[PDB]
Amino acid sequence: IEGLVELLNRVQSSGAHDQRGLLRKEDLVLPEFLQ
Amino acid sequence: REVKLLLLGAGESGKSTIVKQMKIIHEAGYSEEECKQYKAVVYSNTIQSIIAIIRAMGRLKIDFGDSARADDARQLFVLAGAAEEGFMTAELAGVIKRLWKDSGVQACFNRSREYLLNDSAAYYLNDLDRIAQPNYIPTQQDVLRTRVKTTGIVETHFTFKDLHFKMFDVGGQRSERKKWIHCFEGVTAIIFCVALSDYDLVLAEDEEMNRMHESMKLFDSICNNKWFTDTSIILFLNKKDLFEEKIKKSPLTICYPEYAGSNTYEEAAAYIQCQFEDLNKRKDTKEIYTHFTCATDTKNVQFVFDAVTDVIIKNN
Numbered sequence A: 001i002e003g004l005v006e007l008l009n010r011v012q013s014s015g016a017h018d019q020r021g022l023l024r025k026e027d028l029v030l031p032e033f034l035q
Numbered sequence B: 001r002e003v004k005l006l007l008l009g010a011g012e013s014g015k016s017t018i019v020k021q022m023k024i025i026h027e028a029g030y031s032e033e034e035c036k037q038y039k040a041v042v043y044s045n046t047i048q049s050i051i052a053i054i055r056a057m058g059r060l061k062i063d064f065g066d067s068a069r070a071d072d073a074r075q076l077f078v079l080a081g082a083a084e085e086g087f088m089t090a091e092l093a094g095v096i097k098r099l100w101k102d103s104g105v106q107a108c109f110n111r112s113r114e115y116l117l118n119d120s121a122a123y124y125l126n127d128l129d130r131i132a133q134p135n136y137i138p139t140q141q142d143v144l145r146t147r148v149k150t151t152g153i154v155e156t157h158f159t160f161k162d163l164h165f166k167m168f169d170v171g172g173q174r175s176e177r178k179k180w181i182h183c184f185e186g187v188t189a190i191i192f193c194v195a196l197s198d199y200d201l202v203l204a205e206d207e208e209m210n211r212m213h214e215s216m217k218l219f220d221s222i223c224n225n226k227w228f229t230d231t232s233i234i235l236f237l238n239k240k241d242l243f244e245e246k247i248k249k250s251p252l253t254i255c256y257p258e259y260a261g262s263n264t265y266e267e268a269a270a271y272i273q274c275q276f277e278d279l280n281k282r283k284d285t286k287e288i289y290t291h292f293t294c295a296t297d298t299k300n301v302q303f304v305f306d307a308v309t310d311v312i313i314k315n316n
């Protein structure tokens, strides 16, 4: 069913990116409250 | 003899950790030379983790315990950016240790259910003494804890009890209807991973139901889909260690407002087990095979995967 694919794509994508792999330039942009 | 295995479940549920466990238990595992290669990713994971917490402090308006930490925090971004991938200087080590120790940073860390903090964060940051040394060699557990990005489908193959296992983890990468159909084709067993400890996560802004209920919706759909009549459905109720630590301080009523039991590990875990197994609409025909797991615990995975293998054998 196409309903299962919607759920799968939504449910399996979720969680914590920016916290995977080697350090990247984007991960290191200073937080506004620290400026 | 040929056994096709599909790992499904939400992002962060423990899928790729299980994959790594199969490598440790049923393949060659990780030599010391391979372990040395994970040093950079250990460092980046560690820095991403403390950065994620610093960012939440901004969003959540939690101040540093000592105002001097603000300069450390400012400095963290400079020093991490100064790089040397695979090496931590004395000054970076210092900055991170004093941040992780700050009472505000700790206050924010304890509020992790309000934002998205990976479960390897405490592990690395609590092991800073061992990790920050220029002679540090990542143990097998360190490697198991690592978080890498991946390119689409992952597959490890191994032989166990005279069976050829092909274990597919589709992962968080979005896939078209056709790729899924191919994945489902010829599948012996499905292992559905659930992060038990997700029960207390704050609702996202666009989210109608909480993470656990979405996981249940998915499992209902998989488990009752007639295409899987002869497919062995295995349910891993994972992160039980983290669930046991949380259940004391965060009531299960966050996730299930109707829960009337006590907040003991035992009653709350059983309750979740029922919520899942009760979605089975073909109770007389279909059996769910449920295990409570700590995917980061190699012994436990070995024991659980042994029982699962005996299940797949018997189902002939």
Ligand SMILES: Nc1nc2c(ncn2[C@@H]2O[C@H](COP(=O)(O)OP(=O)(O)O)[C@@H](O)[C@H]2O)c(=O)[nH]1
Residues within 6 Å of the ligand: B009, B010, B011, B012, B013, B014, B015, B016, B017, B018, B118, B119, B120, B121, B144, B145, B146, B147, B238, B239, B240, B241, B242, B293, B294, B295, B296, B297
């Ligand atoms: N404490 C604990 N951490 C876990 C467990 N299972 C997975 N993790 C951690 O949770 C994070 C998500 O695991 P992962 O295998 O990447 O889930 P995936 O997104 O489905 O592949 C990682 O940081 C793992 O170290 C568990 O049972 N207990």
